[PDB]
Amino acid sequence: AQNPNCNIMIFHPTKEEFNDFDKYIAYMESQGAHRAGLAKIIPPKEWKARETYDNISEILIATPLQQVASGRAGVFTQYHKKKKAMTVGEYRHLANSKKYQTPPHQNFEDLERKYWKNRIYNSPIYGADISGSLFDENTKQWNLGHLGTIQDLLEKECGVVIEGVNTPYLYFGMWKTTFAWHTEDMDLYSINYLHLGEPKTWYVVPPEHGQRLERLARELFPGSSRGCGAFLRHKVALISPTVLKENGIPFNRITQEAGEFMVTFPYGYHAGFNHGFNCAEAINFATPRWIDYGKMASQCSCGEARVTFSMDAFVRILQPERYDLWKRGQD
Ligand SMILES: O=C(O)CNC(=O)C(=O)O
Ligand SMILES: [Mg+2]
Ligand code: NI
Ligand SMILES: [Zn+2]
Numbered sequence: 001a002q003n004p005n006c007n008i009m010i011f012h013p014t015k016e017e018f019n020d021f022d023k024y025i026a027y028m029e030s031q032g033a034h035r036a037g038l039a040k041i042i043p044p045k046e047w048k049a050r051e052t053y054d055n056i057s058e059i060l061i062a063t064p065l066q067q068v069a070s071g072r073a074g075v076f077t078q079y080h081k082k083k084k085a086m087t088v089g090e091y092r093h094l095a096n097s098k099k100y101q102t103p104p105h106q107n108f109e110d111l112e113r114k115y116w117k118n119r120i121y122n123s124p125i126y127g128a129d130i131s132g133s134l135f136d137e138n139t140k141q142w143n144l145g146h147l148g149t150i151q152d153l154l155e156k157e158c159g160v161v162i163e164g165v166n167t168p169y170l171y172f173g174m175w176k177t178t179f180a181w182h183t184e185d186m187d188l189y190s191i192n193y194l195h196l197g198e199p200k201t202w203y204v205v206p207p208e209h210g211q212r213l214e215r216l217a218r219e220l221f222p223g224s225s226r227g228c229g230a231f232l233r234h235k236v237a238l239i240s241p242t243v244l245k246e247n248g249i250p251f252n253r254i255t256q257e258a259g260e261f262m263v264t265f266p267y268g269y270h271a272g273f274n275h276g277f278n279c280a281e282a283i284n285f286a287t288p289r290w291i292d293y294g295k296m297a298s299q300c301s302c303g304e305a306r307v308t309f310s311m312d313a314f315v316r317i318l319q320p321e322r323y324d325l326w327k328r329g330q331d
Contacts, residue, residue, distance in 0.1 A: 003032025006206035008039065008252045015044040018141040022148065025189075025263070025287060036252060037268025038204040041261040043142065050136040053196045056279070057089030059170070061127035064091065067178055069120040074240035075220050076120050078178060083125060088172055088279075091127055095174035095277035100124060102175040102198065102276035108255050112201060115273050116240045119176050127172030134170065134195050134281055142261065144168045144193060144283045151310070153286040160317055164310030168283040173200070173274030180235045181213065181271040185307055186314045187297040188284040190264045192256070198276030200256045203241060207267040209250045213239075216247050233300035238271060266293035294318045301329035 003009065009031065013024055024041075033039040065080040086094070094100060105111040133145040140146075149166040175198075184190050194200055205213045214232065218225040221237055228234070244251050256262050258278070264270055266289070286294075295318045312330075316323050 001032070002030070003035045006035040006037070006208070006250065006252070008036045008204065008254050009033045010040045010042065012042050013044060015046045015141075018044055018047060021142060022287065028263070029289070033263075034265040034268075035206055035208065036204060037206050037265050038202060038252070038254065038270060039263050039265075040254060040256065041142075041263065043259065043261065047139075047141055049139055049193065049195060050134060053134075053279075056134065057087060057092070059088040059130070059132070061086055061088065061091055061130060061172060065126045065128055066123045067126055068123045069238075071120065073117060073120050074243040076238050077221070077224070077236045078180060078238065079236065080126075081123075088127075091125070091172055091174075092277050094125065100174050108199065108201065108275075111275060115176065115201075116242065119178065119238075119273070122176055124174050124176040124178070126174070126177040127170075130170040130172070131167055132170050133168050134279070142193075144191060144281050147191075147283065147285055150188065150284060150286040151313070153288070153290070154314070154317065157288055157291050158317065162313040162317060164313050166284065166310065168281050171280040171282065173197075173276075173278045173280070175274065175276045177274045178238065179270070179272050181217070181232055181237050181239060181269055182235045183210070183232075183267050183269055183297075184264065184284055185311055186318075187267045187293040188286055188290060189266060190282055190284050192262045192264075192280055192282040194256050194258045194260055195279045195281060196258050197278030198274065199258070200272055200274050200278065200280065201253065202256060202262065202270055202272040203244075203251055203253050204264070205249065205251050205269040207265060210267050210269050212249050213269050216244075216249055228300055228302040228304060230298040230300045231302075231304075232269070233298065233305040235305075266290050267297075291318070299326050301325045303329045306330065
């Protein structure tokens with residue numbers, strides 16, 4: 001068995017290996033990358049996502065989200081308070097302000113310490129989940145707006161044509177902006193490219209151990225767990241590495257820098273934080289290996305998780321028994 005300790009693997013594809021996206025994912029899996037839940041891909045030196053980032057300031061962040069925490073430093077939830085619209089240039093200036101800017105630090109590990117010590121005492125503002133792309137249309141390799149769609153994958157594997165679309169999303173971050181512990185919708189893959197700016201630190205639980213994280217979460221967030229049998233689908237709970245280690249939960253960590261891709265694999269729980277002003281692009285995708293995970297994915301039906309239009313068909317075809325209850329949660 002390849003990668004039996006479920007370490008995060010880092011790949012350096014050549015420009016020739018960068019041509020065929022599906023083939024390279026399958027290669028990474030042949031080497032055991034998925035066992036970690038997360039892999040890093042450093043693009044060949046010849047590649048670029050676009051020519052420059054000098055002209056992005058007028059992108060609008062219609063609904064910036066202030067991430068307000070509750071709990072203790074290592075075990076907390078966050079809610080998202082909607083703020084007034086602002087441009088990316090306005091948001092960059094805000095991120096760099098004395099109130100929001102990254103503190104002085106020695107190295108990534110020092111900054112990580114500071115994050116976990118102090119995150120709860122601040123409420124950073126995240127420009128998350130913005131439909132759009134920063135890849136140039138002429139970028140032919142690993143262009144996240146040009147990937148094979150999940151609907152087409154389901155049709156290819158299973159024979160059933162379904163409605164829905166699959167487009168990327170932009171994320172504008174600042175120091176302490178946080179992504180809560182989650183797997184993807186329908187336990188899909190995700191791919192995330194850090195276009196510019198400061199790093200993003202990731203934590204991940206191997207897919208084979210995801211239920212250990214779920215059991216801890218039920219213990220740590222006992223009200224939330226009574227409310228919903230899949231409350232991590234709400235994407236609000238944080239648990240620190242220290243707490244994970246105290247509770248024996250297997251996990252790994254890695255820091256993504258600008259110019260690097262990360263792939264999350266089906267049922268790979270992940271969480272993390274941004275170091276300072278940055279912009280990432282991410283999208284979900286599927287492969288043949290996903291289908292079995294999609295069929296088994298948990299679902300939130302309490303009403304909180306509320307998701308895209310295109311998840312309807314995935315539930316309807318892959319999980320027909322659950323469909324009625326899940327759709328009630330959507331309406
Ligand atoms: O970058 C973020 O805020 C969150 N990203 C992801 O969870 C991802 O790419 O799967
Ligand atoms: Mg612009
Ligand atoms: Ni994710
Ligand atoms: Zn729920």
